Amino acid sequence: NNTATLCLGHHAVANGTLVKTMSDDQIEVTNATELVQSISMGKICNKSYRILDGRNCTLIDAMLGDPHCDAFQYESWDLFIERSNAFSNCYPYDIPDYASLRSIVASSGTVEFTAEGFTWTGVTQNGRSGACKRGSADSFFSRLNWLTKSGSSYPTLNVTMPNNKNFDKLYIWGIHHPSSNQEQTKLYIQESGRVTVSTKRSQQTIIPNIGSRPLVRGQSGRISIYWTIVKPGDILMINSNGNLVAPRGYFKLNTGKSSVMRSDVPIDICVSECITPNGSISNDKPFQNVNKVTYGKCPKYIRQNTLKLATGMRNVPEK
């Protein structure tokens, strides 16, 4: 013609997608992306972080030196996986404030043990039990030393151990609760024992309590476990006139990125930087709805399963 028409416009697609704005509950855009990670990998990836399968062993069992946990003696981890099936198989015990010790040890990322030359004069050492079998014979926790009367004497034990290193030492010890007054006088001389574990700045005294408990693995007696952190320059002192379950050395505390997690999911050769009880997940999204329990470089856990971020204009097709 003698004229011309020039039209302006924009693109559109066939596979539109609905998003949420401030103006509209649902509106069609050309493209959008998912902001919430919903699927896990079904497995835990062991590249990126040092992952340790606890298998039949809890973390505490592993550090105490329960016979069926022997393989863990020299183990270290970024993340320790505890399984439901885990069981204890040594002398029956309890730890007052069990969760804290589990937490402290978990953070330290190791159960490596350093033996020390303690002198226990006038007593017999290495007490064993049928409730704790190492392969064939009666045994006991490998990191503890059950002390009993030698001859017909249990002298008041007064032992010392100085911390001349530049790190904190963690000492694990315990006390034995016998089942009867007859048992209390047979293994130790005195009718009533006690253990006082002290430093220059702290102290704990535990009194044993005689009496029958439910039979566990043959025995009705019990041991209660306690801990002590000795600072560099300080000095561990143990005082006991009976019932002491002595330490054989110390654990080195480490300021680290280590932790512990409960999961029944398999461990596999794989790469991911984020771990949940359901398995490893992807990092690429800002949010996830898999699990509130996470370890590593993880997206933020939120209630919602899907969130769509628009990456294009409104999609307006032919009418």
Binding site: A4, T5, R314
Partner: protein
């Protein structure tokens, strides 16, 4: 949206434009044609790329924390442990909901703005020589071949050159 271009005076999108996000279609003395505008398209893409990285800093390494599942009931301490975690999750969940509504509103508005910006740009070039058909289309009152149309798209079009011709064609009429 707020500018009333996309799904407004521009009736619909062109599914047959795979070339870009915004552009032109035209009929002249050489037939019909289509071309995309790369400056507008790029201006939109640049605002939409890395959009979330501007607000929420890249995911962070976190290690040992608190326990969030329990076997034994314990009372006070466990009550607190749960409440802390419950509180954190409800607040992040809110941040996420708000952020998506926010960024999406922004994305609709800026893409709608780029369409309006390109129309206005073209309108200001054509001056008196053209008519806003209310369609998103321009009635150009002179002979405009492909080179002439490209000059509109490049922004080199000189309206003075065509003014005289345009005034004739325009004012052919009156009763």
């Amino acid at each position: 949206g707020i500018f009333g271009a996309i799904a407004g005076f521009i009736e619909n999108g062109w599914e047959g434009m795979v070339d870009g996000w915004y552009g032109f279609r035209y009929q002249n003395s050489e037939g019909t044609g289509q071309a995309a505008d790369l400056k507008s398209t790029q201006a939109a893409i640049d605002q939409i790329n890395g959009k979330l990285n501007r607000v929420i800093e890249r995911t962070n390494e976190k290690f040992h924390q608190i326990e969030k599942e329990f076997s034994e009931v314990e009372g006070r301490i466990q009550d607190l442990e749960k409440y802390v975690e419950d509180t954190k999750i409800d607040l992040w969940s809110y941040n996420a909901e708000l952020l998506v509504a926010l960024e999406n509103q922004h994305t609709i508005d800026l893409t709608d703005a780029e369409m309006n910006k390109l129309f206005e740009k073209t309108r200001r070039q054509l001056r008196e020589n053209a008519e806003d058909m209310g369609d998103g289309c321009f009635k150009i009152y002179h002979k405009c071949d492909n080179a002439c149309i490209e000059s509109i798209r490049t922004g080199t079009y000189d309206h003075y050159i065509y003014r005289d011709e345009a005034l004739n064609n325009r004012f052919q009429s009156g009763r």
